[PDB]
Design a protein around this ligand. Sequence first.
Ligand code: 96M
Ligand code: CL
Ligand code: CL
Length: 261
Amino acid sequence: SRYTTEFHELEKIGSGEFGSVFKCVKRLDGCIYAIKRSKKPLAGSVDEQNALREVYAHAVLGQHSHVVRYFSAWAEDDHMLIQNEYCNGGSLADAISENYRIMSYFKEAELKDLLLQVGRGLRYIHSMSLVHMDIKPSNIFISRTKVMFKIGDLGHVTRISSPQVEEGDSRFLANEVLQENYTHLPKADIFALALTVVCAAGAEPLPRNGDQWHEIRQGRLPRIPQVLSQEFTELLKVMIHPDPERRPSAMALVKHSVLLS
Ligand SMILES: CCN(CC)CCOc1ccc(Nc2ncc3cc(-c4c(Cl)cccc4Cl)c(=O)n(C)c3n2)cc1
Ligand SMILES: [Cl-]
Ligand SMILES: [Cl-]
């Protein structure tokens, strides 16, 4: 078994439809990795093409400081194993839940930092003519010890020039993608990033549909209980503009003074 030969398993850190994710130490280098272990997808299934999008996204991208690093993938014993960088801070979804548990929150400066850093990850992905298509808090990961945010799960990554769109979570989905308009996909990532920051900011749980859903896609920003400066707030609001061309590109985002300050 390559998995057991190369690695010692420390604890399960995720599970779901499939499979599990384990925190492991690699024996040769003594470093900690996250390894996703699952039953090998049925040939031709959605789960397989997700795994395919992921491997081939990595082949294009290689490494970036705001993208969760993909080291290796292999299959053995009717399982698929995917080795990633371990982010010791968990996902942004975890951190938001923990904030509610203990009644903490992200200060405005910390929210801007989140926005800027994920923006930097999108800038790189977009510059390679890819789009992520599943930005949301559970796919943003956190490395600490001083904090780095990284984009995880490239399973929905597709090409701008020949997009195959597996829709993401309807809570974070821009209206034009739902309308099967795939001509501005980088701006769907920007949209979802705005709502991701809004979630991080303490907003009520986002609607999956209904009037509240549609109101959001009209460019109306959900209520945020923290007082944010008006400049920060207006930047979030423009990121969910109904006209995607009025949303900033990631390039424009990471040069924004409100964020760099
Ligand atoms: C620490 C105790 N707890 C309570 C929250 C259990 C879960 O806590 C976590 C601690 C750290 C992480 N970090 C982490 N770091 C990297 C990955 C990478 C993948 C990943 C992805 Cl997104 C795609 C393909 C392959 C992999 Cl390994 C992953 O699924 N998870 C959960 C990942 N998780 C998480 C929870
Ligand atoms: Cl098993
Ligand atoms: Cl641009």
